[PDB]
Amino acid sequence: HPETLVKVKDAEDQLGARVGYIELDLNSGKILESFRPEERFPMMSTFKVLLCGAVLSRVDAGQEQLGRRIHYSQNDLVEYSPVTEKHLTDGMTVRELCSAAITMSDNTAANLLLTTIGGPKELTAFLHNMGDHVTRLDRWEPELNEAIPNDERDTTTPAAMATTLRKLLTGELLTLASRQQLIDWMEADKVAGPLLRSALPAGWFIADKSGAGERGSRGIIAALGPDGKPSRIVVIYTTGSQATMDERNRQIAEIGASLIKHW
Numbered sequence: 001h002p003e004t005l006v007k008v009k010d011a012e013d014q015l016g017a018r019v020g021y022i023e024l025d026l027n028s029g030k031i032l033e034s035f036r037p038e039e040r041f042p043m044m045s046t047f048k049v050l051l052c053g054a055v056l057s058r059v060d061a062g063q064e065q066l067g068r069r070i071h072y073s074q075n076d077l078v079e080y081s082p083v084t085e086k087h088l089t090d091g092m093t094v095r096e097l098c099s100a101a102i103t104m105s106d107n108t109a110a111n112l113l114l115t116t117i118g119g120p121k122e123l124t125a126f127l128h129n130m131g132d133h134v135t136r137l138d139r140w141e142p143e144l145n146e147a148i149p150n151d152e153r154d155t156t157t158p159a160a161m162a163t164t165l166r167k168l169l170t171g172e173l174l175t176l177a178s179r180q181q182l183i184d185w186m187e188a189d190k191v192a193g194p195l196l197r198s199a200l201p202a203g204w205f206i207a208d209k210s211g212a213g214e215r216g217s218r219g220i221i222a223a224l225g226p227d228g229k230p231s232r233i234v235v236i237y238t239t240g241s242q243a244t245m246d247e248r249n250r251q252i253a254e255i256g257a258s259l260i261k262h263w
């Protein structure tokens with residue numbers, strides 16, 4: 001909607017940095033609204049949803065099992081691993097790892113899952129093999145959040161990410177069961193409260209994944225809609241701002257308020 005675009009442009013100015021935005025109809029896949037849709041931005045933690053989509057693809061192919069248990073040591077732990085740091089003795093199953101990666105943005109969970117598929121290069125291969133020739137993961141957590149200007153490593157574009165997210169959640173690439181599990185993990189996201197969720201009215205559905213990185217990078221991908229079901233996909237990214245986390249969160253929440261108001 002025009003008013004949401006106004007807010008996206010406001011945000012870009014107030015933050016003094018680029019903001020990327022796109023809104024897709026979930027059923028048709030058509031672009032409803034956009035700003036800098038083809039420009040690159042660091043994915044940050046939003047890649048974790050793509051990673052679990054690759055894992056679910058392997059589950060569908062019989063090459064992986066959600067109940068398989070993965071053991072690891074203190075040597076595998078990296079920063080921001082609130083869930084995995086509590087399970088060094090018992091380990092965690094693949095589904096528990098996807099749940100921790102998506103709902104808590106657990107970094108070690110993401111690295112362990114990347115190991116199951118062969119690393120960043122194999123996640124990029126998975127993306128290329130499903131039609132996304134733009135998105136690329138090059139590094140592991142936490143280095144993938146470096147966000148060096150003009151560096152294309154670990155980046156996506158709002159349009160490629162929204163298109164890929166839609167493919168993972170709808171269609172046939174993944175089985176009905178896997179599509180439902182992926183969106184259920186996103187619905188249970190626990191760490192994106194200050195973003196789109198802050199402006200969400202009671203009764204609305206939201207399945208999301210946020211991201212934060214160096215050099216003011218911040219973003220979120222989501223499937224949301226009124227009456228408890230999603231009907232649109234929204235992707236928002238920004239990088240380069242000197243603004244505080246609170247201000248970057250507020251700008252994204254205000255884009256959300258506009259999206260909701262003019263739905």
Ligand SMILES: O=C(Cc1cccs1)N[C@H](B(O)O)c1cccc(C(=O)O)c1
Nearest residue numbers: 044045080105142145210211212213214
């Ligand atoms: O671990 C990091 C690195 C940094 C997070 C904040 C400044 S640098 N980022 C991940 B993810 O974007 O790669 C992360 C960790 C915890 C919460 C979030 C979030 O989405 O808020 C994101």
Ligand SMILES: O=C(Cc1cccs1)N[C@H](B(O)O)c1cccc(C(=O)O)c1
Nearest residue numbers: 017149214215216217239240241242243
């Ligand atoms: O070196 C950087 C790179 C960054 C880009 C976005 C957040 S930090 N920023 C410094 B700083 O936060 O110490 C900075 C501070 C004030 C103004 C500028 C500028 O580029 O004008 C740059």
